[PDB]
Amino acid sequence: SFTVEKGIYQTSNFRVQPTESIVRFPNITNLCPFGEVFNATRFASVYAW
Amino acid sequence: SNLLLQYGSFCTQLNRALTGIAVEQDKNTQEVFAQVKQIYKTPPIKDFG
Ligand SMILES: *[C@@H]1O[C@H](CO)[C@@H](O)[C@H](O)[C@H]1NC(C)=O
């Protein structure tokens, strides 16, 4: 409403806005072996997957 | 919050009901205790027979 009558009102939150982001991952260097599972010379049979 | 923006009517009625309850509590206290309009002081002497 554009008009508020005399009194005390409990306000829902609208005021806080975050502004900055934090990224915190484990520090790992090795690339994951995509070539061992996608470039493999021979795959297994479906029964012995 | 952007998703909840369309349930503003639901939240407004919830807050209206709670505010009504809150005002009603103060009203109940006023009716029970604030009947007398003057704060009488006990007399210095306690000669109550
Ligand atoms: C997979 O094999 C191809 C050659 O067939 C090669 O060009 C490519 O770099 C390899 N990819 C990975 C992730 O090892």
UniProtKB/Swiss-Prot annotation, chain A:
Entry-listed glycosylation sites: T19, S21, N27, N39
Which residue intervals make up region (Disordered)? 15-31
Q: Say which domain of life the source belongs to.
A: Viruses
- Quaternary state and partners of this protein? Binds to host ACE2. RBD also interacts with the N-linked glycan on 'Asn-90' of ACE2. Cleavage of S generates a polybasic C-terminal sequence on S1 that binds to host Neuropilin-1 (NRP1) and Neuropilin-2 (NRP2) receptors. Interacts with host integrin alpha-5/beta-1 (ITGA5:ITGB1) and with ACE2 in complex with integrin alpha-5/beta-1 (ITGA5:ITGB1). May interact via cytoplasmic c-terminus with M protein. May interact (via N-terminus) with host bilirubin and biliverdin, thereby preventing antibody binding to the SARS-CoV-2 spike NTD via an allosteric mechanism.
Biological role = Attaches the virion to the cell membrane by interacting with host receptor, initiating the infection. The major receptor is host ACE2. When S2/S2' has been cleaved, binding to the receptor triggers direct fusion at the cell membrane. When S2/S2' has not been cleaved, binding to the receptor results in internalization of the virus by endocytosis using host TFRC and GRM2 and leading to fusion of the virion membrane with the host endosomal membrane. Alternatively, may use NRP1/NRP2 and integrin as entry receptors.
Full protein name = Spike protein S1
What is the protein's species of origin? Answer: Severe acute respiratory syndrome coronavirus 2
Q: Which gene encodes it?
A: S
Quote the range of the complete protein represented.
Answer: 305 to 353 of 1273
Curated annotation (Swiss-Prot), chain B:
Q: What is the purpose of this protein?
A: Precursor of the fusion protein processed in the biosynthesis of the S protein and the formation of virus particle. Mediates fusion of the virion and cellular membranes by functioning as a class I viral fusion protein. Contains two viral fusion peptides that are unmasked after cleavage. The S2/S2' cleavage occurs during virus entry at the cell membrane by host TMPRSS2 or during endocytosis by host CSTL.
Provide the protein name. Answer: Spike protein S2
UniProt effect for mutating N15K:
In strain: Omicron/BA.1, Omicron/BA.2, Omicron/BA.2.12.1, Omicron/BA.2.75, Omicron/BA.4, Omicron/BA.5, Omicron/BQ.1.1, Omicron/XBB.1.5, Omicron/EG.5.1
To which species is this protein native?
Severe acute respiratory syndrome coronavirus 2
Parent protein range shown?
750 to 798 of 1273
